[PDB]
Short mmCIF file of C-alpha atoms (C1' of nucleotides) in Angstrom, two decimals:
data_model
loop_
_atom_site.label_atom_id
_atom_site.label_comp_id
_atom_site.label_asym_id
_atom_site.label_seq_id
_atom_site.Cartn_x
_atom_site.Cartn_y
_atom_site.Cartn_z
CA UNK A 2 -66.83 13.92 40.63
CA UNK A 3 -66.88 12.37 37.14
CA UNK A 4 -70.64 12.14 36.66
CA UNK A 5 -71.51 9.53 34.02
CA UNK A 6 -74.70 9.62 31.97
CA UNK A 7 -76.79 6.47 31.67
CA UNK A 8 -77.25 4.78 28.26
CA UNK A 9 -80.75 6.02 27.46
CA UNK A 10 -79.68 6.93 23.91
CA UNK A 11 -76.60 5.91 21.92
CA UNK A 12 -75.35 9.50 22.01
CA UNK A 13 -75.48 9.57 25.82
CA UNK A 14 -73.73 6.24 26.42
CA UNK A 15 -70.22 7.69 26.82
CA UNK A 16 -70.95 11.15 28.26
CA UNK A 17 -68.97 12.01 31.40
CA UNK A 18 -68.79 15.45 32.99
CA UNK A 19 -67.16 17.36 35.85
CA UNK A 20 -69.59 18.82 38.40
CA UNK A 21 -68.79 21.79 40.65
CA UNK A 22 -71.31 23.29 43.05
CA UNK A 23 -69.75 26.52 44.34
CA UNK A 24 -69.95 28.20 40.93
CA UNK A 25 -72.18 31.27 40.75
CA UNK A 26 -75.38 30.64 38.78
CA UNK A 27 -76.38 34.24 38.00
CA UNK A 28 -75.30 36.47 35.16
CA UNK A 29 -71.74 37.83 35.02
CA UNK A 30 -70.85 41.32 36.19
CA UNK A 31 -72.01 43.66 33.43
CA UNK A 32 -69.35 46.40 33.87
CA UNK A 33 -66.61 43.82 33.18
CA UNK A 34 -68.17 42.22 30.07
CA UNK A 35 -67.75 43.15 26.40
CA UNK A 36 -68.94 41.67 23.11
CA UNK A 37 -66.82 39.16 21.17
CA UNK A 38 -67.58 37.95 17.65
CA UNK A 39 -66.65 34.75 15.83
CA UNK A 40 -64.03 34.85 13.08
CA UNK A 41 -64.20 31.45 11.39
CA UNK A 42 -60.41 31.27 11.22
CA UNK A 43 -60.14 33.86 8.43
CA UNK A 44 -57.78 36.84 8.37
CA UNK A 45 -58.27 40.35 6.96
CA UNK A 46 -57.77 39.04 3.40
CA UNK A 47 -60.83 36.78 3.74
CA UNK A 48 -58.84 33.56 3.31
CA UNK A 49 -58.81 30.68 5.78
CA UNK A 50 -55.60 30.76 7.82
CA UNK A 51 -56.59 28.20 10.48
CA UNK A 52 -58.59 25.15 9.44
CA UNK A 53 -61.35 23.41 11.43
CA UNK A 54 -62.72 26.65 12.95
CA UNK A 55 -66.34 27.69 12.64
CA UNK A 56 -69.74 27.85 14.26
CA UNK A 57 -70.08 27.59 18.01
CA UNK A 58 -72.16 29.13 20.77
CA UNK A 59 -72.39 32.88 21.30
CA UNK A 60 -70.01 34.16 23.98
CA UNK A 61 -69.05 37.33 25.85
CA UNK A 62 -65.52 38.34 26.78
CA UNK A 63 -64.63 38.90 30.43
CA UNK A 64 -61.96 41.50 31.21
CA UNK A 65 -59.36 39.66 33.30
CA UNK A 66 -56.74 41.57 35.30
CA UNK A 67 -53.58 39.65 34.46
CA UNK A 68 -51.36 42.59 35.46
CA UNK A 69 -52.56 43.03 39.08
CA UNK A 70 -51.39 46.65 39.19
CA UNK A 71 -53.40 47.57 42.30
CA UNK A 72 -50.71 47.15 44.95
CA UNK A 73 -51.04 47.20 48.73
CA UNK A 74 -54.85 47.35 48.87
CA UNK A 75 -56.36 44.12 50.25
CA UNK A 76 -59.25 42.60 48.33
CA UNK A 77 -62.04 40.22 49.32
CA UNK A 78 -63.33 37.43 47.08
CA UNK A 79 -67.03 37.82 46.29
CA UNK A 80 -67.74 34.78 44.12
CA UNK A 81 -66.30 32.19 41.75
CA UNK A 82 -67.66 32.05 38.20
CA UNK A 83 -67.57 29.94 35.06
CA UNK A 84 -65.81 31.55 32.08
CA UNK A 85 -66.67 30.44 28.51
CA UNK A 86 -63.42 31.88 27.11
CA UNK A 87 -61.04 29.67 29.11
CA UNK A 88 -60.81 26.30 30.85
CA UNK A 89 -60.13 27.87 34.26
CA UNK A 90 -62.61 29.44 36.66
CA UNK A 91 -62.51 33.15 37.46
CA UNK A 92 -62.92 34.98 40.77
CA UNK A 93 -64.52 38.36 41.43
CA UNK A 94 -62.54 40.61 43.77
CA UNK A 95 -63.82 43.68 45.64
CA UNK A 96 -61.24 46.14 46.93
CA UNK A 97 -61.52 48.34 50.01
CA UNK A 98 -62.09 51.37 47.77
CA UNK A 99 -64.97 49.51 46.08
CA UNK A 100 -63.36 48.71 42.73
CA UNK A 101 -64.26 45.26 41.40
CA UNK A 102 -62.05 43.14 39.15
CA UNK A 103 -61.72 39.61 37.77
CA UNK A 104 -58.77 37.28 38.30
CA UNK A 105 -57.85 33.67 37.57
CA UNK A 106 -59.24 31.70 40.51
CA UNK A 107 -56.56 29.54 42.16
CA UNK A 108 -57.40 26.10 43.50
CA UNK A 109 -59.08 26.25 46.90
CA UNK A 110 -60.09 29.91 46.87
CA UNK A 111 -63.69 30.56 47.92
CA UNK A 112 -65.94 33.49 48.74
CA UNK A 113 -64.79 35.65 51.65
CA UNK A 114 -61.06 34.99 51.26
CA UNK A 115 -58.46 37.77 51.21
CA UNK A 116 -55.98 38.48 48.41
CA UNK A 117 -53.25 41.05 47.79
CA UNK A 118 -50.50 42.11 45.41
CA UNK A 119 -47.16 43.66 46.28
CA UNK A 120 -43.70 43.01 47.64
CA UNK A 121 -44.93 42.91 51.25
CA UNK A 122 -48.05 40.82 50.62
CA UNK A 123 -48.45 37.68 52.76
CA UNK A 124 -47.58 34.35 51.16
CA UNK A 125 -51.01 32.79 50.56
CA UNK A 126 -52.72 31.48 47.42
CA UNK A 127 -53.90 34.23 45.10
CA UNK A 128 -51.26 36.72 46.29
CA UNK A 129 -49.09 38.31 43.60
CA UNK A 130 -45.45 39.03 44.47
CA UNK A 131 -42.19 39.58 42.58
CA UNK A 132 -40.19 36.40 42.05
CA UNK A 133 -37.40 37.85 44.21
CA UNK A 134 -39.54 37.59 47.36
CA UNK A 135 -40.72 34.04 46.66
CA UNK A 136 -39.61 31.08 48.82
CA UNK A 137 -37.59 28.36 47.10
CA UNK A 138 -39.49 25.24 46.07
CA UNK A 139 -42.76 27.14 45.65
CA UNK A 140 -45.49 26.18 43.18
CA UNK A 141 -46.63 29.16 41.13
CA UNK A 142 -48.94 30.18 38.30
CA UNK A 143 -49.52 33.18 36.01
CA UNK A 144 -45.82 33.91 35.51
CA UNK A 145 -44.85 37.16 33.77
CA UNK A 146 -42.08 37.54 31.18
CA UNK A 147 -41.92 41.32 30.58
CA UNK A 148 -42.10 43.92 33.34
CA UNK A 149 -45.62 45.35 33.29
CA UNK A 150 -47.02 43.12 30.53
CA UNK A 151 -48.73 40.64 32.87
CA UNK A 152 -48.99 36.90 33.29
CA UNK A 153 -48.40 34.82 30.16
CA UNK A 154 -47.32 31.35 31.31
CA UNK A 155 -49.11 28.65 33.32
CA UNK A 156 -52.68 29.90 32.94
CA UNK A 157 -54.68 26.85 31.79
CA UNK A 158 -56.60 24.74 34.29
CA UNK A 159 -54.26 22.68 36.45
CA UNK A 160 -51.21 24.66 35.32
CA UNK A 161 -48.21 25.08 37.61
CA UNK A 162 -44.50 25.88 37.64
CA UNK A 163 -41.83 24.97 40.18
CA UNK A 164 -39.40 27.61 41.46
CA UNK A 165 -36.08 25.81 41.90
CA UNK A 166 -33.61 28.63 42.56
CA UNK A 167 -32.97 32.36 42.44
CA UNK A 168 -29.36 33.58 42.42
CA UNK A 169 -28.43 37.08 41.33
CA UNK A 170 -30.74 38.61 38.73
CA UNK A 171 -32.37 35.38 37.51
CA UNK A 172 -34.65 32.67 38.87
CA UNK A 173 -34.87 29.12 37.51
CA UNK A 174 -38.31 27.56 37.03
CA UNK A 175 -39.47 24.20 35.70
CA UNK A 176 -42.57 24.37 33.49
CA UNK A 177 -45.22 21.71 33.02
CA UNK A 178 -43.75 20.92 29.59
CA UNK A 179 -40.66 19.56 31.37
CA UNK A 180 -38.40 22.46 30.38
CA UNK A 181 -36.19 24.50 32.72
CA UNK A 182 -35.95 28.22 32.02
CA UNK A 183 -34.64 31.42 33.60
CA UNK A 184 -36.66 34.57 34.32
CA UNK A 185 -35.67 38.07 35.43
CA UNK A 186 -36.22 38.23 39.18
CA UNK A 187 -38.43 41.33 39.07
CA UNK A 188 -41.11 39.51 37.06
CA UNK A 189 -44.15 38.79 39.21
CA UNK A 190 -46.01 35.53 39.84
CA UNK A 191 -48.95 34.19 41.85
CA UNK A 192 -49.01 31.58 44.60
CA UNK A 193 -50.83 28.26 44.35
CA UNK A 194 -52.39 26.17 41.62
CA UNK A 195 -55.09 27.15 39.14
CA UNK A 196 -58.47 25.53 39.67
CA UNK A 197 -60.57 23.09 37.61
CA UNK A 198 -57.79 20.49 37.51
CA UNK A 199 -60.34 17.80 36.59
CA UNK A 200 -61.18 19.54 33.30
CA UNK A 201 -59.16 17.07 31.23
CA UNK A 202 -61.20 14.15 32.63
CA UNK A 203 -64.20 15.25 30.54
CA UNK A 204 -65.45 13.00 27.73
CA UNK A 205 -67.53 14.82 25.12
CA UNK A 206 -69.33 11.70 23.90
CA UNK A 207 -70.56 12.79 20.46
CA UNK A 208 -69.80 14.95 17.43
CA UNK A 209 -72.37 17.59 18.36
CA UNK A 210 -70.43 18.30 21.55
CA UNK A 211 -67.42 19.43 19.50
CA UNK A 212 -69.63 21.26 17.01
CA UNK A 213 -70.99 23.29 19.94
CA UNK A 214 -67.45 24.33 20.89
CA UNK A 215 -66.71 25.29 17.30
CA UNK A 216 -64.53 22.57 15.75
CA UNK A 217 -65.30 21.62 12.16
CA UNK A 218 -64.52 18.05 11.06
CA UNK A 219 -60.98 17.07 10.05
CA UNK A 220 -60.45 15.36 6.68
CA UNK A 221 -57.48 13.00 6.44
CA UNK A 222 -54.80 13.53 3.81
CA UNK A 223 -55.22 10.02 2.39
CA UNK A 224 -58.88 10.67 1.55
CA UNK A 225 -58.11 13.45 -0.96
CA UNK A 226 -56.85 13.48 -4.55
CA UNK A 227 -53.23 14.16 -5.54
CA UNK A 228 -53.96 17.77 -6.51
CA UNK A 229 -55.30 18.50 -3.02
CA UNK A 230 -52.67 16.82 -0.84
CA UNK A 231 -49.33 15.01 -1.17
CA UNK A 232 -51.04 11.99 0.43
CA UNK A 233 -53.86 11.91 -2.13
CA UNK A 234 -54.20 9.38 -4.92
CA UNK A 235 -53.96 5.65 -5.42
CA UNK A 236 -56.27 2.74 -6.23
CA UNK A 237 -57.56 1.60 -2.84
CA UNK A 238 -55.94 2.42 0.48
CA UNK A 239 -52.18 3.03 0.44
CA UNK A 240 -49.80 5.44 2.18
CA UNK A 241 -46.63 5.16 0.10
CA UNK A 242 -44.93 8.29 1.49
CA UNK A 243 -43.30 9.66 4.63
CA UNK A 244 -46.09 11.61 6.40
CA UNK A 245 -46.16 15.35 5.65
CA UNK A 246 -48.49 18.30 6.09
CA UNK A 247 -50.68 19.78 3.33
CA UNK A 248 -47.88 22.28 2.62
CA UNK A 249 -45.04 19.74 2.59
CA UNK A 250 -43.67 19.80 6.16
CA UNK A 251 -42.76 16.45 7.69
CA UNK A 252 -45.09 15.68 10.60
CA UNK A 253 -43.20 12.98 12.57
CA UNK A 254 -40.21 14.19 14.57
CA UNK A 255 -39.15 17.18 12.45
CA UNK A 256 -38.24 20.16 14.65
CA UNK A 257 -39.44 23.63 13.63
CA UNK A 258 -38.18 26.21 16.16
CA UNK A 259 -35.96 28.85 14.56
CA UNK A 260 -35.84 31.81 16.99
CA UNK A 261 -32.25 32.57 18.01
CA UNK A 262 -33.12 35.63 20.12
CA UNK A 263 -34.27 33.81 23.27
CA UNK A 264 -32.00 30.74 23.13
CA UNK A 265 -30.07 32.02 26.16
CA UNK A 266 -33.12 31.88 28.43
CA UNK A 267 -33.48 28.11 27.86
CA UNK A 268 -31.33 26.15 30.32
CA UNK A 269 -32.43 22.57 29.61
CA UNK A 270 -34.73 21.55 26.77
CA UNK A 271 -37.66 19.21 27.36
CA UNK A 272 -35.69 16.77 25.15
CA UNK A 273 -38.17 17.15 22.30
"C1'" A B 1 -67.16 12.50 9.01
"C1'" U B 2 -67.82 11.27 14.18
"C1'" A B 3 -67.08 10.55 19.97
"C1'" G B 4 -62.42 7.62 21.82
"C1'" C B 5 -57.05 6.45 21.16
"C1'" A B 6 -51.97 7.22 19.92
"C1'" C B 7 -47.33 9.68 17.56
"C1'" U B 8 -45.06 14.24 16.65
"C1'" C B 9 -44.16 19.71 16.85
"C1'" U B 10 -44.97 24.53 19.56
"C1'" G B 11 -42.11 28.46 25.98
"C1'" C B 12 -45.33 33.03 23.25
"C1'" A B 13 -42.85 38.54 19.42
"C1'" A B 14 -45.15 30.40 20.04
"C1'" A B 15 -45.47 26.63 16.14
"C1'" C B 16 -48.57 26.99 11.61
"C1'" A B 17 -51.19 29.78 7.70
"C1'" C B 18 -52.23 34.25 4.17
"C1'" G B 19 -49.11 38.60 1.96
"C1'" A B 20 -44.64 41.49 -2.24
"C1'" A B 21 -44.24 44.40 2.48
"C1'" A B 22 -46.91 46.67 6.23
"C1'" G B 23 -49.67 43.53 8.74
"C1'" U B 24 -53.65 39.84 9.81
"C1'" G B 25 -55.63 34.94 11.71
"C1'" G B 26 -53.70 31.19 15.74
"C1'" A B 27 -55.81 34.34 20.39
"C1'" C B 28 -57.64 39.41 23.13
"C1'" G B 29 -55.82 31.91 23.97
"C1'" U B 30 -50.61 30.18 27.11
"C1'" A B 31 -48.47 22.89 27.27
"C1'" U B 32 -55.49 20.29 31.02
"C1'" A B 33 -53.49 25.03 25.36
"C1'" G B 34 -52.66 25.33 19.90
"C1'" G B 35 -51.01 22.84 14.77
"C1'" G B 36 -49.85 18.36 11.70
"C1'" U B 37 -50.52 13.03 10.92
"C1'" G B 38 -52.81 8.01 11.48
"C1'" U B 39 -56.57 4.75 13.53
"C1'" G B 40 -61.86 4.93 14.44
"C1'" A B 41 -67.73 3.19 20.05
"C1'" U B 42 -66.99 -0.85 23.27
"C1'" G B 43 -64.52 -6.03 25.13
"C1'" C B 44 -59.68 -8.93 24.90
"C1'" C B 45 -55.56 -7.11 22.73
"C1'" U B 46 -51.90 -5.21 19.61
"C1'" G B 47 -45.69 -10.48 18.01
"C1'" C B 48 -40.37 -10.07 15.50
"C1'" C B 49 -36.85 -6.61 12.41
"C1'" C B 50 -33.10 -0.11 12.90
"C1'" G B 51 -30.21 -4.03 7.64
"C1'" G B 52 -32.73 0.31 3.54
"C1'" U B 53 -35.05 5.65 3.31
"C1'" G B 54 -36.36 9.38 6.67
"C1'" C B 55 -35.91 11.85 11.53
"C1'" U B 56 -32.96 12.79 16.19
"C1'" G B 57 -28.03 13.23 18.72
"C1'" G B 58 -22.74 13.02 18.45
"C1'" A B 59 -18.02 12.96 16.14
"C1'" A B 60 -14.23 16.46 13.93
"C1'" G B 61 -11.22 12.27 11.04
"C1'" G B 62 -11.15 12.81 4.60
"C1'" U B 63 -13.42 16.58 0.28
"C1'" U B 64 -14.13 22.31 -0.88
"C1'" A B 65 -17.53 27.79 -2.74
"C1'" A B 66 -17.13 32.48 -2.78
"C1'" U B 67 -12.88 35.29 -0.73
"C1'" U B 68 -7.48 36.00 -0.27
"C1'" G B 69 -3.29 35.81 -3.68
"C1'" A B 70 2.79 32.59 -2.82
"C1'" U B 71 5.47 31.10 -6.81
"C1'" G B 72 6.25 30.45 -11.82
"C1'" G B 73 5.84 31.50 -17.26
"C1'" G B 74 4.81 35.11 -21.23
"C1'" G B 75 4.20 40.48 -24.29
"C1'" U B 76 6.18 45.20 -24.44
"C1'" U B 77 9.59 48.76 -22.62
"C1'" A B 78 16.23 50.63 -21.42
"C1'" G B 79 21.04 49.89 -22.47
"C1'" C B 80 24.67 46.95 -24.63
"C1'" G B 81 26.80 43.91 -29.25
#
RNA sequence: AUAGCACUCUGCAAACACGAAAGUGGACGUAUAGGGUGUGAUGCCUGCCCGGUGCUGGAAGGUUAAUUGAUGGGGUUAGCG
């Protein structure tokens, strides 16, 4: 709905939020919750390996069933829930046998709906089928790359892929990056779009909003001294060099992919 | 420094970073996501130049490193005068 705050204070002048009503307001299911700790972007040597990471609100991890192993048993959707660990909403599923699991809620799914996984499952949003049994021209999410590993592609809010063709052992899909790639037919996928497609319309409005999410401020390369950065130094403001990273890698147009193993699976590049 | 904006890279065993390796962070995340760079609420806006350096794509035309080893020349070695 794009709710906009009124300018009572300078920090609230440019605050705009997405509002959703169907979300469950209680606590998450305890049996499917475990503790997660902050890392600060440091590895097991104690050094910083990713910059601009720190602080943030305390969070719990939710165990999400990306695999969807339970096959043939129908499940009913209990509720839709907010998830701090991801931009998409999650859905609680109850199976006939009574087992409860979490899944990535597709767009439009609500409490009381029916979902299933298997080769013979009906073609409705939230149903998980092998790519072989999928109609051409379908819009899919949570695509799997390795048999049994689970969904890896098209998981963020609003994500989707287009199934263009399946001939022989391979199916061609267009990804949201604009690339066309081929996948083994026996890899599974899910029907429909993933919810919360308005997430990218949000406007944080102030620095504290990012500090809450755990992003430390970014210092430009020009603001440092020569010992710190290739961009550092000079009397006044001056660039004087082709832009590069702190470790010397050109940052404008230089390609970096080097994996030759999977080059076959790429039909048409996004034209990077 | 900041919220906002824009360029570029990354299809996941991701890019990037630490390490001598094992491995670890990125992330128990998956292009509405992650890294690098510049500008810096908002309003109106953001002209010309690809000659130079860089980057991206193509061309297969000239130059050749290891490698391989044609041919030639030389030392010594036999027998003859």
